Amino acid sequence: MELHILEHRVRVLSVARPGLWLYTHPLIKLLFLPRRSRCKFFSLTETPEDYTLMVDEEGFKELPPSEFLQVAEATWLVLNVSSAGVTKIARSVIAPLAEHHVSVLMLSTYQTDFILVREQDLSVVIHTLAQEFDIYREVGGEPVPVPSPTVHPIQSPQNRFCVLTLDPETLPAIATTLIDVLFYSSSITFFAFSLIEGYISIVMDAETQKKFPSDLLLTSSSGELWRMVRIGGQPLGFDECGIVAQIAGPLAAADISAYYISTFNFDHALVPEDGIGSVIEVLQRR
Amino acid sequence: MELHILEHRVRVLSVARPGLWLYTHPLIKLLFLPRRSRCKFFSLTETPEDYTLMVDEEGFKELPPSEFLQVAEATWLVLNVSSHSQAAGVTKIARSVIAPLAEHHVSVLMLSTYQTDFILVREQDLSVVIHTLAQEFDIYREVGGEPVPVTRDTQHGPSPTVHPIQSPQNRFCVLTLDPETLPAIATTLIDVLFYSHSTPKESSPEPSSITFFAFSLIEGYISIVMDAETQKKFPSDLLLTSSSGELWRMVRIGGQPLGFDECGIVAQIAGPLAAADISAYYISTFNFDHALVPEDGIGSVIEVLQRRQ
Ligand SMILES: NC(=[NH2+])NCCC[C@H](N)C(=O)O
Ligand SMILES: NC(=[NH2+])NCCC[C@H](N)C(=O)O
């Protein structure tokens, strides 16, 4: 098993909903126009609270400072396990990093699971994981060999979610709908779009999927729908460890698959829709 | 022949290039989202100076005031002559519409599109317009999308002058599009309009290039005026031309910003072009006027227009 430190230096941002209009011009650029910036890591998540942006240093330069725009304190590095679910790395990655006081942010996409850590913790990350993983650093597309735990409240909306991908050539065909959804539109709004290393991933409501032109959004498991578990009552911050470990741990022990996405304020786990009853019950035992 | 007063009340605006960030949200909406606006008249023209908007009262509400937004005084009414019974465009109406309105001191704004030629007049001038044109035209007013017969019914700018002209070397296309195919060109249209390098604002009788891009959605119909080089950026089988071979040269009519009060600017261009039977589309922007003539006729046009007095 290999751990890869990817060639991305990511900043974590919050755009306040009343001030999204101001970032329309830079965000349209990052969403749709790859020749217009050197951005290679772009992730946008809409929640009721805010729009969460995970973006590299180059994409970060597109976004001017304002009262509507929060920036998390550190530069984040991106981790990836190779040879689509967080359950499989709960014991090997998530729990050991939580135990060694390394704070994470999660980004599950259609393609793979990204684990983000702060630049300051890389030495601790390597030390913790060098024994189990062959650790590689991505340079020029080539692999090169190298704050107190709390039980958090959980809730599940009735929304049914799809984890989707797209042929990068067909992105222009969904542009107007994606613009409409993002900038102009128990229930909780959740919309995630990411463009990472040319790969498109979209997390979407079943009702929102109806708005898109047919036969463009692709998935290997068509009709596989996911229920959301929202994690935290208060805003979670970026210092507290063991939050992902509280969720992925019991789910791995029950052998239930999960996507995991961290927003600026809250954590979000996606579980198979018919297994939601088992999931709530399993997590109730912490 | 008939003259139709269309069912539109228009405001004329200028968004300065440095203020594009503030207006991207309202502009994208008006361009691509017909369900989210009651707007039935939207015209956007990119120049090096600005973005000129001609928009109805409903679309006008989407645009908040700022140091980057300039709005003309008047509410404008839209006139149209359907004439298909020889030279094309505003040349068809130079003698019948444009010259008489100038003589009776009615200031105009022109918007030639793929479909037809729109003549914009200030609301306060409608009585004079009808009186000037009733003898030649059967005048109708659009009410609920149906024609209704019209039987009822001081200068504050600079003196009329001969305005300096220049002809940029760009080759322009007048294009339409199936409205159902607008989503397919959206990203390219966005890229061209809002994210491209434009020609500097800072003389030449024939400059190499000027930035000029016109898009309009009026009563469901799309019109695009575009550089021939710019056309290559778009996907292949979507833009519709109706021309095989010959394109259009711009004559920019300028000097000082033309304002909205001086009359006889369109007349001093369209009048001689009619006398020389040259096809002309004519687009007014916030600051300047733009005549499009057949590219092979450009030498004749310049020669004709330099005999103005
Ligand atoms: N803003 C957030 N979503 N914070 C929670 C992320 C997970 C937490 N830092 C952990 O290491 O377990
Ligand atoms: N802003 C302008 N483009 N003004 C010039 C428009 C033509 C002028 N008002 C005329 O009646 O002849």
Author numbering:
A (entry chain B): 1 to 83, 92 to 154, 170 to 208, 223 to 323
B (entry chain A): 1 to 85, 90 to 157, 166 to 214, 218 to 324
Paper lines:
The structure of the arginine-bound CASTOR1 was solved by the single-wavelength anomalous dispersion method and was refined to 2.5 Å resolution, yielding an R-factor of 17.5% and a free R-factor of 22.4%. There are four arginine-bound CASTOR1 molecules in an asymmetric unit, forming two CASTOR1 homodimers which have almost identical overall structure with a root-mean-square deviation of 0.9 Å for 570 Cα atoms. However, ACT1 and ACT3 fold together to form an 8-stranded β-sheet flanked by four α-helices on one side, and ACT2 and ACT4 fold together to form a 10-stranded β-sheet flanked by four α-helices on the other side, and the two β-sheets are orthogonal to each other and form a β-barrel-like core which is sandwiched by the two layers of α-helices. In the structure of CASTOR1, two CASTOR1 molecules form a tight homodimer via a twofold non-crystallographic symmetry. The homodimer interface is stabilized by largely hydrophobic interactions and a few hydrogen-bonding interactions among residues from helices α1 of ACT1 and α5 of ACT3 of each monomer, which buries 1 857 Å2 or 7.1% of the total solvent accessible surface area as analyzed by the PISA server. In the structure of CASTOR1, arginine binds to the interface of the ACT2 and ACT4 domains with well-defined electron density and reasonable B-factor. The arginine-binding pocket is largely formed by residues from α7, the β17-β18 loop and β18 of ACT4 and the α3-β7 loop of ACT2, and additionally the β16-α7 loop (residues 269–279) acts as a lid to conceal the binding pocket. In detail, the α-carboxyl group of arginine forms four hydrogen bonds with the main chains of Val112, Gly279, Ile280 and Val281; and the α-amino group forms three hydrogen bonds with the side chain of Ser111 and the main chains of Val112 and Glu277. The guanidinium group forms five hydrogen bonds with the main chains of Gly274, Thr300, Phe301 and Phe303, and additionally makes a salt bridge with the side chain of Asp304.
